[PDB]
Amino acid sequence: LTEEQIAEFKEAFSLFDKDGDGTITTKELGTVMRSLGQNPTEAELQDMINEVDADGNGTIDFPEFLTMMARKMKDTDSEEEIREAFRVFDKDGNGYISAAELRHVMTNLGEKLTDEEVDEMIREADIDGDGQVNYEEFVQMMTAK
Amino acid sequence: FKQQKVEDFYDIGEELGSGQFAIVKKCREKSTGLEYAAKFIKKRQSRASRRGVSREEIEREVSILRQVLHHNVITLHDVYENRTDVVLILELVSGGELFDFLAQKESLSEEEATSFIKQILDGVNYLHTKKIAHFDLKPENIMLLDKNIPIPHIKLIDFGLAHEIEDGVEFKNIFGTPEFVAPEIVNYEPLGLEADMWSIGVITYILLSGASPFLGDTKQETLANITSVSYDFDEEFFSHTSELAKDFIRKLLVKETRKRLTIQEALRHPWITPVDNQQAMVRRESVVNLENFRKQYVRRRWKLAFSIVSLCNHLT
Ligand SMILES: [Ca+2]
Ligand SMILES: [Ca+2]
Ligand SMILES: [Ca+2]
Ligand SMILES: [Ca+2]
């Protein structure tokens, strides 16, 4: 997926790599996971990094992040990981992603985006026009393109 | 070409992209410390053209890059050759695509759009004065030297389809991205410098509306719309577009090659260079449609959020 892999690469790596040194230490992955309500231990972070650590330097390089993305997309059902992503986005469990929830998730990820960008994201994801994102609209945002 | 090893003089780094039979990687010259982009083109040199590039095409591309020296066009620095590849060490262009930079803007008038389009027109003018056709003008090949200045510097890259237009010889071929090719390309008709102007018209259409003029649901529909010159200025996408811009695009998207605007005529079109203050003020007040342009950008932002969340879920 040359175009999609390049886009997800450039974006996700830079979102994790908040200091910009070319690598991803366990601390950055830990901070990102803790901003998303998860609480992994240092041993678990090191085990995550070691399963793809090809050059054995302790951190995750660029192609190691690519191979980790590949193993993620290969070891799970697409629908199930999309469901879990939606459950992460939709916090109150009402079945609709509002603007507040989307903005909260984006800011927890480390994005400094204004309200206009959150509004345009919601609108681009909104198909029926109620102002929120259905689960179907979510998967159609994540479906084939 | 230099028969010496590339690794002997350049430190090879991250991969910047690729194409069909070529791969570009960032590199640094060891003797100077300056950074460049090494484009490895896999040699073929066998009659079975299924895998590899002919030596004729490589020599043509290298000759074109050597003859071209402009501030809006990429510059060839060196060429090496081993037993498998030919390596073109070129000027590093690391500012991304022009459209990727324009999308992340808050508002874009037609004046700044015409400034960028005029950088493109200066590049194409330098190319056409030497009777060199680019034949692969598309937003993927409109890069920025650096997105670190207010008005970035545009560079034209990827001369894999460039060809020398000689007087009195017929050059016909089928290549390029179908969305951006001229009617004489899809019809296998004699080619010239006019296809570059047609592609510039398509690029201006896309920059101004976010939609493509002849792009259909399938390749057949796209080719039929190109050969039939079938496009419109829909008010849903062209509500704010000025009349000068529409006249410019209309004068660029013509089937008959002799009636199509040349690069110099596009440089003198009032939309690029206004004649009076009235049309300059009109070009100031006209706003480009930045919503249909940022559509795909915000979609990929959605996908990035999804990828981060899914990677965090997959590990716990
Ligand atoms: Ca780091
Ligand atoms: Ca590593
Ligand atoms: Ca909700
Ligand atoms: Ca909805």
Swiss-Prot record, chain A:
Subunit structure: Homotetramer. Interacts with MYO1C, MYO5A and RRAD. Interacts with MYO10. Interacts with CEP97, CCP110, TTN/titin and SRY. Interacts with USP6; the interaction is calcium dependent. Interacts with CDK5RAP2. Interacts with SCN5A. Interacts with RYR1. Interacts with FCHO1. Interacts with MIP in a 1:2 stoichiometry; the interaction with the cytoplasmic domains from two MIP subunits promotes MIP water channel closure. Interacts with ORAI1; this may play a role in the regulation of ORAI1-mediated calcium transport. Interacts with IQCF1. Interacts with SYT7. (Microbial infection) Interacts with Rubella virus protease/methyltransferase p150.
N6,N6,N6-trimethyllysine modification, residue list: 112
Gene: CALM1
Disease field: Ventricular tachycardia, catecholaminergic polymorphic, 4: An arrhythmogenic disorder characterized by stress-induced, bidirectional ventricular tachycardia that may degenerate into cardiac arrest and cause sudden death. Patients present with recurrent syncope, seizures, or sudden death after physical activity or emotional stress. CPVT4 inheritance is autosomal dominant.
Region (Necessary and sufficient for interaction with PCP4): 73-145
Notes on how activity is controlled: (Microbial infection) Inactivated by S.flexneri OspC1 and OspC3 proteins, which specifically bind the apo-form of calmodulin, thereby preventing calcium-binding and activity.
Record-listed Phosphotyrosine modification sites: 96, 135
Glycyl lysine isopeptide (Lys-Gly) (interchain with G-Cter in SUMO2) crosslink site(s): 18
Name used for this protein in its record: Calmodulin-1
Positions annotated to bind Ca(2+) 1: 17, 19, 21, 23, 28
Residue span(s) of domain EF-hand: 4-39, 40-75, 77-112, 113-145
Family: Belongs to the calmodulin family.
UniProtKB/Swiss-Prot annotation, chain B:
Complex formation: Homodimer in its autoinhibited state. Active as monomer. Isoform 2 but not isoform 1 can interact with ATF4.
Originating organism: Homo sapiens (Human)
Domain remarks in the Swiss-Prot or TrEMBL record: The autoinhibitory domain sterically blocks the substrate peptide-binding site by making both hydrophobic and electrostatic contacts with the kinase core.
Outcome when changing residue 310 to A: No effect on Ca(2+)-calmodulin independent phosphorylation or apoptotic activity
Cofactor annotation: Mg(2+)
Gene that encodes the chain: DAPK2
Keyword check for Nucleotide-binding: yes
Any GO BP: positive regulation of apoptotic process
Activity control mechanisms: Activated by Ca(2+)/calmodulin.
Region (Calmodulin-binding): 264-316
Catalytic activity from the UniProt record: L-seryl-[protein] + ATP = O-phospho-L-seryl-[protein] + ADP + H(+); L-threonyl-[protein] + ATP = O-phospho-L-threonyl-[protein] + ADP + H(+)
Protein kinase domain residues: 10-272
Region (Autoinhibitory domain): 279-288
Tissue spec. comment: Expressed in neutrophils and eosinophils. Isoform 2 is expressed in embryonic stem cells (at protein level). Isoform 1 is ubiquitously expressed in all tissue types examined with high levels in heart, lung and skeletal muscle.
Similarity comment: family membership: Belongs to the protein kinase superfamily. CAMK Ser/Thr protein kinase family. DAP kinase subfamily.
Name listed for the protein in its UniProt record: Death-associated protein kinase 2
Keyword GTP-binding attributed: no
Function: Calcium/calmodulin-dependent serine/threonine kinase involved in multiple cellular signaling pathways that trigger cell survival, apoptosis, and autophagy. Regulates both type I apoptotic and type II autophagic cell death signals, depending on the cellular setting. The former is caspase-dependent, while the latter is caspase-independent and is characterized by the accumulation of autophagic vesicles. Acts as a mediator of anoikis and a suppressor of beta-catenin-dependent anchorage-independent growth of malignant epithelial cells. May play a role in granulocytic maturation.
Keywords for the protein's UniProt record, in alphabetical order: Apoptosis, ATP-binding, Calmodulin-binding, Cytoplasm, Cytoplasmic vesicle, Kinase, Nucleotide-binding, Phosphoprotein, Serine/threonine-protein kinase, Transferase
